[PDB]
Design a protein around this nucleic acid. Sequence first.
DNA 1: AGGTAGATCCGGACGC
DNA 2: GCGTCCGGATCTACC
Length: 273
Amino acid sequence: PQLPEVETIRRTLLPLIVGKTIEDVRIFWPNIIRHPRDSEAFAARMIGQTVRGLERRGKFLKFLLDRDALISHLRMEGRYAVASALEPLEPHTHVVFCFTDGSELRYRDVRKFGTMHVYAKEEADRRPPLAELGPEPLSPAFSPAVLAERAVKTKRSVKALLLDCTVVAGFGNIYVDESLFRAGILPGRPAASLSSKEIERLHEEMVATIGEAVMKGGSTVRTYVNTQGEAGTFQHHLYVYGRQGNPCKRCGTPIEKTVVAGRGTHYCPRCQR
DNA sequence: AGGTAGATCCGGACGC
DNA sequence: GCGTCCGGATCTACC
Ligand SMILES: [Zn+2]
C-alpha cells in the first residue's frame, strides 16, 4: 500500500472503529510490535483507551486513542478488518484489538512485514518511524524547489530518490514508475542530471498521479482492497506498472521491465528520456 | 564517498 | 515441485 491505498483504508476504516473502547489486545506474532518492544506492555497500555480518530502520514496509519497514538505500517500485505468476536479468525491474523461492544479490529499480514509503534500522542511525531518522514506530496510542503534541493545533491537514480521517504512521503513502486513515465524521465537517470524543467514536470505529475489514485480508491494489482474488501480502480489508469511486453498506451512501443533501486521497474523507452 | 546489489524479514501465487 | 515474482524497507558487503 502506498499513499492512495493507505488513504482509502483510513477513510473506510475510521467510521467502523471511532468511539469504540479497547477491552483486550491479542498478539499472535510479536515481531510486528516494535514499540514498546515488550508486546505485553503494548497490549496493557492500550486497554481502556477509546479510538478518537484515524490519520495518515505517508504510508502510515495513525490511530488516535486517549493518551496514545498507534502508528501502523501495512508494508506489502497488511490489512485491517472489523468483525465480531464470536467468529473464528481468518488465516494470517497476527494482532487483534477487542472492543467493549463485542467487535474486533483484526490485523492480517501474510508476510508479517507490518509494524506497530505506540507512543504518547505528543511524542509520536518526534520518534521513529514518523520522525524522518518527508513532506506530504499533496501539501504546499512538497514543491519543485523541495524536490530540486534533494535531486541536485545526488547521482543516485531518480527512482531511488522518489522511493526515499525522507525526500517525499507516500510513493512506492507503482506511483514512482507511473510518475516518471508521465514526466518523460527514465527511472535510471541520475537525480542530479534532471533539468529544472524536468523537475517541475516531475513534481506536477507526482501530484497529479497520487491525487488521481486517491480519487480512484487506490490500485488493486495483486492483493490490495479497501476496508470493505472493495478493489480500487486506479490499476486501469496505469501506463507502465505491470505492463511489460504490452504496447505503450501513448506510442505503442513495448513497455520494458528492468531492476532499478532494487525494484522491478517499468518504463517506455520512447516516451521516457 | 556514497551508490548499488544482495540478504533479510516472510509466505502465497504462478508458470513451467 | 521449483524458481521467481511481489503496493516496504532496512542492513551489509562491495567498490
Ligand atoms: Zn511510449
